[PDB]
RNA sequence: CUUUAAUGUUUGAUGUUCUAACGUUGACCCGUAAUCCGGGUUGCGGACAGUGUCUGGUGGGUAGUUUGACUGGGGCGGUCUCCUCCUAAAGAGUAACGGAGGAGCACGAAGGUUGGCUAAUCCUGGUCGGACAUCAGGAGGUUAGUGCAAUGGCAUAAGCCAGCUUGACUGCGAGCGUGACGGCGCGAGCAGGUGCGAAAGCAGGUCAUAGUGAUCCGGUGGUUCUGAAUGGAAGGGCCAUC
RNA sequence: UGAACUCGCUGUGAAGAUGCAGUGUACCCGCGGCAAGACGGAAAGACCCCGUGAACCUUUACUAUAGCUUGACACUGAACA
RNA sequence: GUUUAUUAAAAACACAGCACUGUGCAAACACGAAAGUGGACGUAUACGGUGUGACGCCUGCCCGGUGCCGGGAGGUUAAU
RNA sequence: UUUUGUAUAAUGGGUCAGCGACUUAUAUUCUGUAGCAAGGUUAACCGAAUAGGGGAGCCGAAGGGAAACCGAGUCUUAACU
């Protein structure tokens, strides 16, 4: 009665830290919020993280809950 | 699919219409939502129609 | 005898300046209430034929 | 319908262009009934077109050359 | 007009009679030493029967064909598309008739915005009331909840309540993810016109991931785009949609 | 009937060796017999499966049709109720 | 008695008998696009089809279904 | 030869000689080469004729749009940073 499965949705991180990206590029594909959008990063209705400006993507930790954020530095 | 589909016709003279779905028995009342009309470029009341 | 062009293809692709072919997206015929307006808007404009299928297309209609 | 290049526009008959004799000039074809003039460049001798359509480029070209447009 | 009755009219179903069509594998005569056939005379049937065209029913009597794949041989059983986790070896992807579960919806609000609030489970007290209803205080700190299975997320709450509303809006969309392709997903920003808020701002449906079906052939509405001599229309085309 | 200067055994090997490895045995060549082997000869397996193969047969499989049957019109008319 | 000439001669087939059913004769039925033949130079004590299978004792119950026969109120229903 | 894999006990061949399997026509695309060049080339046919005539026609230099139509722009849109 088993044997059913769903086709893989290829989630994960598409651009890693220190990598220059163009505006509108997708940085992370996620179901919930693994990472929270920081400066120059927007969160889509799908929780996808996209860059609102050209720069290098950076990871860090903020907030009382030690959550992980993604930001873009214009450099 | 017990919920069926309808058509909303703009009250204005233009024939532009929207489409949506609703449950007749639960809410048999008509729908008078105000929506944008591209032909006249104004927000007008759309009356539900067959 | 001269090659016979596939009539079905001739009604679905046109030659362009650089030898490419344009077509219409195959999702805007019926069952449109459930489709989002964004998806319908994107399918409206014509699209260029992909390279993978370009070889098949040119074979079907070698006269256009 | 066909489009007539500005280059060959002066190759029909002296400096007069008309719907007739284009088929004789053999630049459009016997069956072609309508006709339009397109900007092709390299036009020197002034020409006159009767019954043709000369949108903007060839119109400026012939006018600078010394041609005229009439219906 | 409701309700009646003469004459004339269109008549059609039905019944009776007649014969001149037609039938006669009835009789007699002739062609003709001929059980064929034809002609004549007569008898019996008779506008039937029978035949042609059209049409409904019946019709394996006959004919042309179909009757899937996976598969630890085949058959039987089960499965076939989509979603969650595991297998999957810390990017992505990754098979088995491998181990567990779901979906073919729902909602004009459960959507948008503004404002406000913050659970489960226990302890003490208290009419019915008792393990478990509601009330007050405390412990606890998300073990709750999130329209629906699972995973991930969510206190700025994505959870709960209320006000006002229709942005579940139209034309686009740089730039990306994803697939062999068809295709699918994300999207700041621009124009027009709206909603909420004092305002900055938010809103192109729903916490996200299933709720879906290509093309062809057709239906409905709009648009002089076309409309085969011309003026129209039919029919196509485009847009919306079934 | 591929060609042969055509032994036994144990093992290896596309998994049952006259032909490979190791080892043992055996002068060369006939004739009469036996039939264990040469997966011996004969027959592009009838079994099983595959082919979007074929052919026949079956039926309340599909679509047709001969035949049978219904009506309309025609050949087909005339008088009465 | 008959049968798989060439691996099966049998319990199979046929059989006299029995029953059902069709047929009024231009018979049913069969072979034929049709004419015309067979049935039959016969006509119900005859002919065709079907099942059973000498003879003896028998052959029970069921008409829903599928066929067949008869009826007809109402419904549905082509061409025209 | 066929196979993941053959001395295989998988298939084929007794031997020799002869014959025996990627061709042809007409179109289209690409490459090489030759001619001409914003031009290139003729088909049928005519022709004391592989010459020479014949330029009907085809391909190309301009595309965009379903189309009207527009035009180095065009379509999309009321209109495009």
Q: Which nucleotide is nearest to A22 (CA to C1')?
A: E175
Inter-chain Cβ pairs, chain B and chain C, closer than 8 A: 5
Helices (H), chain C: 7-10, 37-43, 51-60
**Measuring CA to CA, how many Å separate C42 from each of A75, B32, C26, C38, C51?**
34, 29, 12, 6, 21
For residue B21, the distance in angstroms to the closest alpha carbon of chain C comes to 8
Per the structure block, which two tokens stand in for C4? 């016979």
Domain that holds residue C44: 1-64
Asked if B3 is an interface residue toward chain C (Cβ–Cβ < 8 A), one would say no
Which helix (H) or strand (E) segment holds residue D57: the answer is helix D57-65
- Neighbour count for residue A29 (Cβ, 10 Å): 16
For the four alpha carbons of D28, D34, D40 and D41, in that order, the dihedral sign comes to positive
Distances (CA, A) of C34 to A51, A52, B25: 30, 31, 21
Question: Could you give the number of structural domains in chain C?
Answer: 1
The experimental technique behind this entry is cryo-EM
Contact B20 C33 (CB under 8 A): yes
Contact list, C32 vs chain B (CB under 8 Å): 19
Burial C30-50 (b: 16+ CB within 10 A, else e): eeeeeeeeeeeeeeeeeeebe
Query: Can you name the CATH fold of B1-50?
Result: Rubrerythrin, domain 2 (2.20.28)
**Chain C hits for B19, Cβ within 8 Å:** 32-33
CA atoms within 13 Å, Cβ hemisphere of A37 = 20
Which residues of chain B have a CB within 8 Å of the CB of C33? 5, 19-21
Which residue of chain C comes nearest to B20, CA vs CA? C33
Under DSSP, is residue A21 helix (H, G, I), strand (E, B) or coil? strand
Question: What are the boundaries of each domain within chain A?
Answer: 11-75
């Amino acid at each position: 009665r088993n044997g059913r499965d769903s086709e893989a949705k290829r989630l994960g991180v598409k651009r890693f830290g220190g990598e220059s990206v163009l505006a509108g590029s997708i940085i992370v594909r996620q179901r919930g919020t693994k990472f929270h959008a920081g400066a120059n990063v927007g969160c889509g209705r799908d929780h996808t993280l996209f860059a609102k400006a050209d720069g290098k993507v950076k990871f860090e930790v903020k907030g009382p809950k030690n959550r992980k954020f993604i930001s873009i530095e214009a450099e | 699919g017990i919920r069926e589909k309808i058509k909303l016709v703009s009250s204005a003279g233009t024939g532009h219409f929207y489409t949506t779905t609703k449950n007749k028995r639960t809410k048999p009342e008509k729908l008078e939502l105000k929506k944008f009309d591209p032909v006249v470029r104004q927000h007008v009341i759309y009356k539900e129609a067959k | 005898p001269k090659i016979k062009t596939v009539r079905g293809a001739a009604k679905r692709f046109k030659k362009t300046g650089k030898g490419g072919f344009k077509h219409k997206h195959a999702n805007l015929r019926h069952i449109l209430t459930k489709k989002a307006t964004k998806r319908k808007r994107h399918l409206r404009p014509k699209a260029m034929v992909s390279k993978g299928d370009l070889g098949l297309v040119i074979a079907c209609l070698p006269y256009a | 319908t066909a489009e007539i290049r500005l280059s060959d526009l002066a190759k029909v008959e002296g400096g007069v262009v008309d719907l007739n004799t284009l088929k004789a000039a053999n630049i459009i074809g016997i069956q072609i009934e309508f006709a339009k003039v397109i900007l092709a460049g390299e036009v020197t001798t002034p020409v006159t077109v009767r019954g043709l359509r000369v949108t903007k480029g060839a119109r400026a070209a012939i006018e600078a050359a010394g041609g005229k447009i009439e219906e």
